[PDB]
Design an enzyme around this catalytic site. Structure first.
Site, PDB file in Angstrom:
ATOM      1  N   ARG A  34       0.823  -1.202   0.000  1.00 49.16           N
ATOM      2  CA  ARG A  34       0.000   0.000   0.000  1.00 49.16           C
ATOM      3  C   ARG A  34       0.861   1.257   0.000  1.00 49.16           C
ATOM      4  O   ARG A  34       0.357   2.348  -0.261  1.00 49.16           O
ATOM      5  CB  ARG A  34      -0.948   0.027   1.204  1.00 49.16           C
ATOM      6  CG  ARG A  34      -2.079  -1.008   1.158  1.00 49.16           C
ATOM      7  CD  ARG A  34      -2.938  -0.868  -0.095  1.00 49.16           C
ATOM      8  NE  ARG A  34      -3.598   0.434  -0.159  1.00 49.16           N
ATOM      9  CZ  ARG A  34      -4.597   0.803   0.636  1.00 49.16           C
ATOM     10  NH1 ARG A  34      -5.061  -0.039   1.552  1.00 49.16           N
ATOM     11  NH2 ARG A  34      -5.114   2.019   0.528  1.00 49.16           N
ATOM     12  N   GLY A  57       2.497 -15.534  -9.303  1.00 48.71           N
ATOM     13  CA  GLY A  57       1.671 -16.693  -9.028  1.00 48.71           C
ATOM     14  C   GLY A  57       1.065 -17.206 -10.321  1.00 48.71           C
ATOM     15  O   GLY A  57       0.299 -18.175 -10.329  1.00 48.71           O
ATOM     16  N   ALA A 114      15.252   6.752   2.463  1.00 54.35           N
ATOM     17  CA  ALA A 114      15.154   7.011   3.903  1.00 54.35           C
ATOM     18  C   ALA A 114      13.885   7.702   4.395  1.00 54.35           C
ATOM     19  O   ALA A 114      13.291   7.273   5.381  1.00 54.35           O
ATOM     20  CB  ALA A 114      16.387   7.801   4.372  1.00 54.35           C
ATOM     21  N   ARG A 172       3.940   1.144  10.529  1.00 57.41           N
ATOM     22  CA  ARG A 172       3.956  -0.285  10.795  1.00 57.41           C
ATOM     23  C   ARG A 172       4.645  -0.682  12.089  1.00 57.41           C
ATOM     24  O   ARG A 172       4.318  -1.715  12.672  1.00 57.41           O
ATOM     25  CB  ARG A 172       4.565  -1.023   9.605  1.00 57.41           C
ATOM     26  CG  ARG A 172       3.913  -0.639   8.294  1.00 57.41           C
ATOM     27  CD  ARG A 172       2.393  -0.820   8.323  1.00 57.41           C
ATOM     28  NE  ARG A 172       1.787  -0.329   7.083  1.00 57.41           N
ATOM     29  CZ  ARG A 172       0.516  -0.502   6.724  1.00 57.41           C
ATOM     30  NH1 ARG A 172      -0.330  -1.165   7.507  1.00 57.41           N
ATOM     31  NH2 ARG A 172       0.088  -0.006   5.571  1.00 57.41           N
TER      32      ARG A 172
HETATM   33  C1  FAD Z   1      -2.888   0.747  11.358  1.00 61.27           C
HETATM   34  C2  FAD Z   1      -3.256   0.957   9.892  1.00 61.27           C
HETATM   35  C3  FAD Z   1      -4.660   0.722   9.459  1.00 61.27           C
HETATM   36  C4  FAD Z   1      -5.059   0.918   8.051  1.00 61.27           C
HETATM   37  N1  FAD Z   1      -6.414   0.683   7.687  1.00 61.27           N
HETATM   38  C5  FAD Z   1      -6.848   0.864   6.336  1.00 61.27           C
HETATM   39  C6  FAD Z   1      -8.274   0.633   5.872  1.00 61.27           C
HETATM   40  O1  FAD Z   1      -9.186   0.269   6.604  1.00 61.27           O
HETATM   41  N2  FAD Z   1      -8.565   0.858   4.480  1.00 61.27           N
HETATM   42  C7  FAD Z   1      -7.566   1.285   3.537  1.00 61.27           C
HETATM   43  O2  FAD Z   1      -7.896   1.459   2.354  1.00 61.27           O
HETATM   44  N3  FAD Z   1      -6.270   1.496   3.946  1.00 61.27           N
HETATM   45  C8  FAD Z   1      -5.864   1.306   5.296  1.00 61.27           C
HETATM   46  N4  FAD Z   1      -4.476   1.538   5.707  1.00 61.27           N
HETATM   47  C9  FAD Z   1      -3.559   1.980   4.605  1.00 61.27           C
HETATM   48  C10 FAD Z   1      -3.451   3.547   4.682  1.00 61.27           C
HETATM   49  O3  FAD Z   1      -4.726   4.107   4.370  1.00 61.27           O
HETATM   50  C11 FAD Z   1      -2.356   4.048   3.671  1.00 61.27           C
HETATM   51  O4  FAD Z   1      -2.729   3.670   2.342  1.00 61.27           O
HETATM   52  C12 FAD Z   1      -0.959   3.439   3.996  1.00 61.27           C
HETATM   53  O5  FAD Z   1      -0.567   3.788   5.317  1.00 61.27           O
HETATM   54  C13 FAD Z   1       0.103   3.951   3.036  1.00 61.27           C
HETATM   55  O6  FAD Z   1       0.540   5.291   3.524  1.00 61.27           O
HETATM   56  P1  FAD Z   1       0.908   6.622   2.945  1.00 61.27           P
HETATM   57  O7  FAD Z   1      -0.151   7.192   2.112  1.00 61.27           O
HETATM   58  O8  FAD Z   1       1.248   7.536   4.072  1.00 61.27           O
HETATM   59  O9  FAD Z   1       2.173   6.286   2.136  1.00 61.27           O
HETATM   60  P2  FAD Z   1       2.777   6.346   0.710  1.00 61.27           P
HETATM   61  O10 FAD Z   1       1.720   5.843  -0.256  1.00 61.27           O
HETATM   62  O11 FAD Z   1       4.066   5.598   0.606  1.00 61.27           O
HETATM   63  O12 FAD Z   1       2.969   7.843   0.616  1.00 61.27           O
HETATM   64  C14 FAD Z   1       3.942   8.670   1.453  1.00 61.27           C
HETATM   65  C15 FAD Z   1       3.659  10.226   1.323  1.00 61.27           C
HETATM   66  O13 FAD Z   1       3.510  10.657  -0.040  1.00 61.27           O
HETATM   67  C16 FAD Z   1       2.123  11.094  -0.017  1.00 61.27           C
HETATM   68  N5  FAD Z   1       1.349  10.774  -1.149  1.00 61.27           N
HETATM   69  C17 FAD Z   1       1.639   9.715  -2.029  1.00 61.27           C
HETATM   70  N6  FAD Z   1       0.778   9.678  -2.937  1.00 61.27           N
HETATM   71  C18 FAD Z   1      -0.158  10.662  -2.791  1.00 61.27           C
HETATM   72  C19 FAD Z   1      -1.326  11.122  -3.460  1.00 61.27           C
HETATM   73  N7  FAD Z   1      -1.739  10.506  -4.564  1.00 61.27           N
HETATM   74  N8  FAD Z   1      -2.032  12.250  -2.924  1.00 61.27           N
HETATM   75  C20 FAD Z   1      -1.616  12.918  -1.764  1.00 61.27           C
HETATM   76  N9  FAD Z   1      -0.500  12.552  -1.045  1.00 61.27           N
HETATM   77  C21 FAD Z   1       0.215  11.410  -1.588  1.00 61.27           C
HETATM   78  C22 FAD Z   1       1.894  11.790   1.423  1.00 61.27           C
HETATM   79  O14 FAD Z   1       2.526  12.985   1.966  1.00 61.27           O
HETATM   80  C23 FAD Z   1       2.377  10.464   2.095  1.00 61.27           C
HETATM   81  O15 FAD Z   1       2.416  10.483   3.552  1.00 61.27           O
HETATM   82  C24 FAD Z   1      -4.038   1.366   7.012  1.00 61.27           C
HETATM   83  C25 FAD Z   1      -2.640   1.589   7.488  1.00 61.27           C
HETATM   84  C26 FAD Z   1      -2.232   1.400   8.864  1.00 61.27           C
HETATM   85  C27 FAD Z   1      -0.765   1.665   9.198  1.00 61.27           C
END
Ligand code: FAD
Ligand code: FAD
Ligand code: FAD
Ligand code: FAD
Lengths: 215, 213, 212, 214
Positions: A73, A84, A159, A169
């Site tokens: 994700r 697979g 990093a 995580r």
């Molecule tokens: C405890 C826990 C429970 C969760 N439960 C669910 C759930 O019920 N349903 C679900 O669908 N997901 C769930 N997730 C997944 C969560 O919604 C995020 O998709 C996941 O944490 C990936 O994080 P991120 O967006 O911060 O990171 P990355 O995708 O790696 O992105 C990192 C940074 O770049 C950004 N960014 C990247 N792309 C975009 C974009 N297109 N627009 C705006 N900013 C962007 C932000 O500044 C972001 O913090 C869960 C995650 C955790 C840790």
């Protein structure tokens, strides 16, 4: 470096580019620019994250699919997984130890809960073999295998993104299984970028477990 | 450790590299759960059918020095990392790109090309002297610098992977792009070639879209 | 909606996809004011921002190039600047005397303003002298200063937009960019009041927005 | 508009911002002339100026098998939101005998359908058994098959959506996900007719979209 996770998984470092100083060199350009170690701390607490994008890692990971799906994700990174569709899947599933159910009152004993999971894995895998043996295409025969099946992949990330990954995580809200992989990732990270890591926990880390678990 | 001079005062310098051609092979070969002869063949295969994710596991870090009008074009490539010198935090060095007479190889002008060069240096000098003047009169650096022309040199660090790097080349290593940017894209390609022979060759043979490489 | 910025610039809304309820639907994966607004604050307070990516805007901005160089550093968004191959004009940002307010300068603020104007005229004339002479614009325009005005289209989502506000709608940012961000903030508040409200209370990392 | 896929899935349109002209206006940086505006779309597509198409956005609601979602979520320039398996139905993708057509098997095609339905039932049984026993959802669900259906919201712009169609609306992609990309293509065609035609003529690299209609 190879660390063993769960009953059959692992996290292994393939390559690494740069270290704590890479972040410092990158930051010097702005003001034309021991002391270096102080700059990292400064960057961290003032919100200047970009300099850390210049440190990069590549890991080889073997984990249960239900863990892989959560990991993938994270979009700011690169991935390459075993297919697979083009490969014969191995007989390796994640069977939770009895101590995993500790803390939850259950009708049946933990060994029973563990006994059943394995059983379902065998019936599932055995059927997967009849089909492949009968001429069924792999890409279709595998839809019957459970989410606890092991898979492998490569992960290249910098990093700054890695620190976002640990924030999410290596935390008590994320699932127990992926927390284990987080600690391994955190350990390797500390070994390669000790100053950045120290500053991270002390200034920007938002999670909980890394301030109570060595390395 | 490579370095290449561009234009009258600029350059492109390689700082680090992670991996090589095999990095792509190992990342890809992990899909089938799996020799020199085979490996090169694999890279070309991937390049032919557009399987480019594996090349994302090769990374470069450059140190560039170029005029602002070139830098702006360059920064439009979002899939990469950047760190630049701040014009609102330090005194700016009298370093501007002055086109040479040959720059007009094909354009006939009222005045001799040498005069065009002279004229450009003048307006640049005049603008620079007003900058120093306002600064010493207590004016804020971030404000005084707005009188400076687009040919003023800047510096930055650039970390990018092989896949995005090949996208930058298809766009800037082409005649349709400005001559100044081409010069920089040529330097980026020579370094990419040096470090990733097989990958670079496969790129020129089954994917490069430009026309000057 | 159009807001004039500085002496000759502006920020205008061109289109928008969704509103506060777009984020609520994304989080529940499906398809009572009180129930919904409580969820928006819940997601905001715990850091679950992905739902806000399902809201998007497209602005038409007119700013000086140096303001534009900082703006374009925001990678998670879409841009399109004027080139003169489809849509060119020439105007420059000349600060007001009040801009040098607070700083004790050698010459009067009114003179700092004059010198900037003088250079612009000389730089601009030299430019036209080169075109009428036969030098291609791509070369001739390199003598024009950083306060030259340009225009672009900006398409960005709510999550990234709040990142933009945490960095530009803040005192550490340059004053000129601050003015453009304040504009971006007002429009955002108009289209997503609930989301804007929760942003200021639990995640806003800046300072100037809570003072105006 | 909603479209059914496989035995229990679908693709549903939730929202959309702009149309073909949103690209035209962005390319000129302005704000009328059909012949001309359509002539520009084709120019942009032909000479590779694809950034103007990033100014068109969609949001879809999809229901699909986990082995399909995994391949799908692989597209990073996009926004996702799925149902929580460890917090948030008896539905699995059961292949039809017509799916194994063209393959020489030792057993009747109908036996495969029966072999797959049996394990799905078994697994599901042991799962509901564990839940009631007190085992946490996030743990007991690890015994469910990869053919279990899931749902998610997907927001993606026109340029990124064209990349998805290039790779998935193609014979080299698994047959299952090909069906979804076809539905995606149909909606896209309905909302941005000029861009789609230009895409097919100058940039589309796949095969099936020039064979099948809409
Ligand atoms: C405890 C826990 C429970 C969760 N439960 C669910 C759930 O019920 N349903 C679900 O669908 N997901 C769930 N997730 C997944 C969560 O919604 C995020 O998709 C996941 O944490 C990936 O994080 P991120 O967006 O911060 O990171 P990355 O995708 O790696 O992105 C990192 C940074 O770049 C950004 N960014 C990247 N792309 C975009 C974009 N297109 N627009 C705006 N900013 C962007 C932000 O500044 C972001 O913090 C869960 C995650 C955790 C840790
Ligand atoms: C007061 C001030 C002073 C500044 N001084 C300087 C300076 O001297 N030099 C300079 O170069 N810049 C400078 N900047 C620009 C700053 O460093 C950022 O580039 C700018 O704020 C854009 O932010 P971003 O990287 O967070 O956002 P975006 O690029 O828009 O990205 C949004 C989110 O996605 C992320 N993300 C996107 N791409 C990647 C990636 N490849 N790897 C990891 N995470 C990613 C992060 O989570 C990020 O916050 C300054 C900004 C301010 C406000
Ligand atoms: C000859 C020439 C003329 C030009 N004329 C103009 C002009 O008139 N106006 C103007 O504004 N610019 C102009 N540009 C700049 C050009 O439009 C792009 O901004 C520049 O090439 C950066 O490219 P990129 O999007 O391919 O790269 P990157 O931003 O580095 O992206 C690389 C890849 O990731 C993608 N990608 C990244 N982010 C997104 C996203 N948010 N949505 C969808 N796909 C995404 C695509 O597959 C892309 O090719 C010109 C460039 C050239 C070479
Ligand atoms: C027939 C088929 C077989 C496949 N087999 C496998 C397999 O065996 N193993 C496996 O792991 N995957 C496999 N995949 C997935 C494939 O490797 C890609 O991950 C998937 O197609 C997503 O595509 P994308 O990278 O083009 O798209 P997106 O992730 O949506 O990105 C769109 C554009 O932005 C870009 N971009 C985004 N992020 C970055 C970045 N960090 N660096 C450089 N450019 C970037 C590129 O220009 C890209 O095309 C397969 C796909 C298909 C269609």
């Amino acid at each position: 470096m190879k660390i063993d996770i769960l009953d059959k998984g692992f996290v292994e470092l393939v390559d690494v580019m740069g270290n704590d100083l890479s972040a410092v060199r990158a930051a010097r350009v702005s003001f034309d620019m021991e002391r270096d170690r102080h700059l990292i701390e400064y960057l961290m607490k003032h919100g200047h994250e970009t300099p850390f994008e210049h440190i990069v890692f590549t890991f080889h990971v073997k984990a249960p699919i239900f863990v892989a799906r959560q990991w993938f994700r994270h979009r700011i990174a690169s991935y390459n997984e075993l297919s697979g569709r083009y490969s014969k899947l191995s007989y390796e599933f994640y069977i939770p130890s009895p101590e995993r159910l500790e803390g939850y009152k259950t009708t049946i004993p933990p060994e029973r809960v563990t006994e059943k999971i394995s059983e379902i894995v065998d019936k599932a895998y055995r059927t997967y073999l009849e089909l492949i043996e009968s001429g069924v295409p792999r890409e279709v025969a595998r839809i019957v295998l459970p989410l606890n099946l092991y898979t492998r992949f490569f992960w290249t990330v910098n990093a700054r993104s890695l620190m976002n990954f640990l924030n999410l995580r290596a935390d008590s809200h994320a699932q127990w299984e992926i927390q284990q992989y987080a600690l391994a990732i955190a350990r390797i990270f500390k070994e390669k970028c000790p100053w950045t890591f120290e500053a991270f926990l002390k200034y920007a880390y938002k999670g909980d477990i890394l301030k109570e678990v060595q390395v």
